[PDB]
Design a protein around this ligand. Sequence first.
Ligand SMILES: CC(=O)N[C@@H]1[C@@H](O[C@@H]2O[C@@H](C(=O)O)[C@@H](O[C@@H]3O[C@H](CO)[C@H](OS(=O)(=O)O)[C@H](O[C@@H]4O[C@@H](C(=O)O)[C@@H](O[C@@H]5O[C@H](CO)[C@H](OS(=O)(=O)O)[C@H](O[C@@H]6O[C@@H](C(=O)O)[C@@H](O)[C@H](O)[C@H]6O)[C@H]5NC(C)=O)[C@H](O)[C@H]4O)[C@H]3NC(C)=O)[C@H](O)[C@H]2O)[C@@H](OS(=O)(=O)O)[C@@H](CO)O[C@H]1O
Length: 215
Amino acid sequence: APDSVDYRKKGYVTPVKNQGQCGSCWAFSSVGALEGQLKKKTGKLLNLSPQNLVDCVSENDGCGGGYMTNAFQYVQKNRGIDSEDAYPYVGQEESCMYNPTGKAAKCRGYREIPEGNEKALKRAVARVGPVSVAIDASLTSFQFYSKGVYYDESCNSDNLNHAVLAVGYGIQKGNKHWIIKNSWGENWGNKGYILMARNKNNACGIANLASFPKM
Ligand SMILES: CC(=O)N[C@@H]1[C@@H](O[C@@H]2O[C@@H](C(=O)O)[C@@H](O[C@@H]3O[C@H](CO)[C@H](OS(=O)(=O)O)[C@H](O[C@@H]4O[C@@H](C(=O)O)[C@@H](O[C@@H]5O[C@H](CO)[C@H](OS(=O)(=O)O)[C@H](O[C@@H]6O[C@@H](C(=O)O)[C@@H](O)[C@H](O)[C@H]6O)[C@H]5NC(C)=O)[C@H](O)[C@H]4O)[C@H]3NC(C)=O)[C@H](O)[C@H]2O)[C@@H](OS(=O)(=O)O)[C@@H](CO)O[C@H]1O
C-alpha cells in the first residue's frame, strides 16, 4: 500500500462526463471502474457506455437510481458492455439497445469492500485500481466545492445519495484524502474532481458501499 496512489497519472482514467438531469451517477461510477480495469488488463483506455446500463439494467431503476453491484452483474451476464460511441449517452431512459457489435469490455463479476472500512478501501484502491463508491453529496458545501480536502460536519454516512469513482488517495498539507472523480461535468468542483477527507471516521459514507468489477 503506497503512501499515495493516483490512477489518472497511470493512464487508467477517462475525462469527466456529465450525467445531466438523470439519476445515473451509479452508471458512470460503474463505467469508470470498468474503464480502469479495461486499461489494466488490455492497455487500452476507452470510454464505456453508461446509457447501456441505464437502459438495459433491470436490476436498477434507470434515471431514478441504482447500485454499481447490479451493473457489474448485468455486464457479466450480458457478456459485454458497449463503448460510449456505440451507445451514446442521452440523459434519459429508453429501451435496451445493446449491440454486441459495439462491445468494448467484459466482466467476471464484482467484489465488495467490507462496510465502513477505509483501510480496506485503501488497499483495494492500491491493488485493483479505480473503485466505485457511494457518498452523501446532498450538502450545500458539496455543491459549491472548489478546492481543498472536502470535510463537512453535517455529512451523513447513512444517507448514500450519490455514486462516484475513487481514482486514488493521498495527503494535502497533512490532510489525508480520497481523489474522487464526479460526473457533474468539468465546471463542477476542481475540473469535475473533488478531494474528500480520508481516515476521518468514514466521512460521507465513503467506504460503506464500495465495490469493483472483476476482469
Ligand atoms: C489481499 C492479499 O493478497 N493479502 C491478504 C492478507 O493481507 C493484507 O493485505 C495485503 C495486501 O497485499 O494488501 C498485505 O500487504 C501488506 O500491507 C501492509 C499494511 O497494509 C504493508 O503495506 S503498507 O504498510 O501499507 O505500505 C506491507 O507492505 C510493505 O509496505 C512498505 C514497507 O516495507 O513498510 C513497502 O516497502 C517499501 O516500499 C517502498 C515503495 O513501495 C520502497 O520500495 S521500492 O518500490 O521503492 O523499491 C522501500 O524501499 C527500499 O529501498 C532500499 C532500502 O531502503 O533499503 C532497498 O532495501 C529496497 O529498494 C527497498 O526495500 C520499501 N522498504 C521496505 C522497508 O520494504 C512495501 O510495499 C511492503 O514491504 C504489505 N505487504 C504485502 C506483501 O502486500 C497486508 O499486510 C495485509 O493487511 C490478509 O488480509 S488481512 O486483512 O490482513 O487479514 C489475508 C487474511 O489472512 O488475506 C489476504 O488475501
